[PDB]
């Protein structure tokens, strides 16, 4: 575990993250340098979930009781894409292929455990 | 002064400090050999110590070639990764070819593992321990180099895409070790397909060896530097033979029932037990696998446990 | 004071404010002549340069000590790998190994001309500082108590004291021969300042050389300091040479001595000194030739040191047998790779080819020293051929009923030729020198007969057998068969007899053992030398006997073959 160092992800839901991340980053600063390219889309606040999904993906949570990775559920990703995606595509920004939502576990499975609201 | 002219003092040294890492490598190799043969009649019944004593694998069987190879590859891999990591100054790793442009839209870089360092040390120690001049020692040397270059050849260019917003348009690449699993599978195949050496009946008269010998093994050394070399046929692994360190097949776990078990593993119970005459005895108890997990909303991940029945049989 | 230190690829001087080499280990100087000598432990050499030249190259393994004698003009060195100390003239000539026994890993060496003493250290399990005479007299261990990894031995000629450091105990001691004061590899002195080099600081630490106070630093960043000395004329006090005008009448080496005229006449390696005590014999009179797989070497049997000077020969690939004719002084050896026989002198000069043609497995060669002929056997082609010593007039002398022939020998004064055979039925045979009267002398209890010796003096023949691992003795006709020794026998066996001893090769062909042909005493003569194949002990001077062939080749146009019943001429 390490401590969240990226501004946008402080107080996103967890204070502890691991490295390397799902994006294969050395330091938290490296993951922040990449997630910062979304800052426009963040300021627009095109989706409330976008910040949580992108922060669970670039600096995933690190827990001292659960040592298996914990990704956001597929619905959170599909919701951030549903809300944010139309503007970015309309301006030529594809939902990033690493961020694809069919690559994530779905909520409601003890085997596929994820983070979401009920 | 770890890296010095190495003639008088300090230099010519630096052999004991590495022996631990080398032993760890050979242990990883032995564990992988045990993995590759987990459900076969020969299941890599080898210790780390034994590959120095040569006791328990003096049989120039198909499986000893693989054992030699996989242990040389394990030692080389482990010491190459020790060197490559910073535990030993990263040895400034494979700095050659770094920075150049390797293709359209990607460049070399990162810290490529200094494989030639690991190979150098592994040769220095492992081939030293391979004492004797007989044909079997040449076979073992062959299989050793076979595993060292199996570890080397398996190195692959791994990359990280550092383009705009993460696009793989531009990316930095380095040369990384492969997964130890793929090397284990490779040596598994090499064991399944090891081959016996010359086995020549004529053997040019060598009662006195000053002129005889030292040429026989010379002609028996045209063997694939990837392939493992063995001379004797492999014994029957159904049977116990305490002279060879073979503990027999009785009492060995096999896999009978299994959702996703290899036909090899599913047949393993008949092959080790039923094909060898022994009977199949079971175990009352059952295993457990976490289940009923309830990832609380936000911040907390909490997962409950479940219980399930494992399957296996014992050639009792 | 200038400070000269062996870097490793460099040699350079420091003050009070040559490159391109691989692992320099030693350095010294002769200030009067402006000379600088250095040792390379990797190059296995000692060279010289003035203020490059080869000085000692003829065979080091790890030479760590090197000191130039300015009064007797001699160079002393120690080789830590080969465990031996050698001396030579100032230009490299007349090289002499002073010590070799009871030496572990001889490192640093030092000499004391005015006193006529040398000194050196041992870095073995029993590290020590020991001195001896500059002529290798009376090896004496001086310091043995409490030292480990000792280095930087230094003598103070100004105060008759001996200093040293301890690269393991981080001390610098001083003594003289006995009394020892403690004050770190090599060290030197200049005026007031004792400078040392710290195994773990890579800097030139400095202190007072009388007291020690002032542990100053002279030069930092010096990573490799294998040695340090003071380069000064005042570092080599003048005295007259007791040898005087011309080596004090010594024909060869005039070495400093502690006793008597303070000079001692010496002779180069192997050669013996005549009753004169001033005139050497003309070289060593013996040659015990040894055919290894890739070299050819000689061992004198006159002196107990048994030192194998390597012959300076090119392209030896699979030598087997060697021998030497004393009458003309020609050495003939065979090469299983070149598939040929070569000639040459003890020096190795005048190397010539004798036979190049139809040879496969030439398992036997024989010099005729009376009639001046040459016989050889070929296990490949299964025939005994004969030429002259020139190598011309080659003639097939025996071909039928001989299979896998190996050792061949001749008795010119009687007229008999005995050889061994393998193949379908192994045997030891004897014939007259023209192949006539081919008769089998030993028939049974033979497997793979490997070697045959003749005792010309006492009418005896000796043989050994690869398959039966036995060496047997027998009379040259009226049998008296007896197995002299029971031991494993190398396929290719260097076997020879001369005098009261018998020379043979061990199973691994790594060593030559001897057995006292008379008694039974077995002493291993040469060891640790693999791929031994063949041997012929011989007296380079002494030539015993003659036969009618000895006059005008017995009137034969080619081969003079002597029978006991007469003599027959032969043709190519």
Author numbering:
A (entry chain A): 35 to 152
B (entry chain B): 23 to 338
C (entry chain C): 21 to 37, 47 to 80, 86 to 217, 227 to 615
Excerpt from the publication:
To initiate signaling, Wnt simultaneously engages the extracellular cysteine-rich domain (CRD) of a seven-transmembrane receptor Frizzled (Fzd) and an extracellular domain (ECD) of the coreceptors LRP5 or LRP6. The activated Wnt–Fzd–LRP5/6 complex inhibits the destruction complex, leading to the accumulation of the transcriptional coactivator β-catenin which translocates to the nucleus and induces the expression of Wnt target genes. However, these binary complexes lacked LRP5/6 that interact with Wnt through their ECD consisting of four Tyr-Trp-Thr-Asp (YWTD) β-propellers flanked by epidermal growth factor (EGF)-like domains. The structure of the ternary haXWnt8–mFzd8CRD–hLRP6E1E2 complex resolves the basis for coreceptor binding by Wnts, revealing a modular determinant that not only controls LRP5/6 domain specificity, but also appears to differentiate the non-canonical Wnt5a and explain its coreceptor independence.
To prepare the soluble ternary complex, we cocultured S2 cells expressing haWnt8–mFzd8CRD and hLRP6E1E2, and the complex was purified by a series of affinity and size-exclusion chromatography (SEC) steps. The peak fractions corresponding to the 1:1:1 haXWnt8–mFzd8CRD–hLRP6E1E2 complex were subjected to cryo-EM analysis. Two-dimensional (2D) class averages of the complex revealed the central Wnt bridging the small globular mFzd8CRD and the tandem β-propellers of hLRP6E1E2. Three-dimensional (3D) reconstruction yielded the 3.8 Å nominal resolution map, revealing the stereotypical Wnt–FzdCRD binding mode as previously reported. hLRP6E1E2 appears to “cap” XWnt8 at the top of the structure by engaging two sites on XWnt8 distal from the Fzd binding site. Site A is formed by the XWnt8 N-terminal loop, and Site B is formed by the linker between N- and C-terminal domains (NC-linker), which insert into the E1 and E2 funnels in the center of the hLRP6E1E2 β-propellers, respectively. Both binding motifs in XWnt8 were not resolved in the previously reported XWnt8–mFzd8CRD crystal structure, suggesting they are disordered in the absence of LRP6. The flexibility of the unusual interaction mode seen has presumably limited the quality of our cryo-EM map, precluding the placement of amino acid side chains for the XWnt8 N terminus and NC-linker. While the N-terminal interaction is particularly tenuous, the NC-linker mainchain clearly shows that the central region of the loop inserts into the funnel. We find that deleting the hydrophobic N-terminal loop (XWnt8ΔN) reduced LRP6 binding similar to XWnt8ΔNC. Since the effect was less pronounced than deleting the NC-linker, the NC-linker clearly plays the major role in driving the Wnt–LRP6 association.
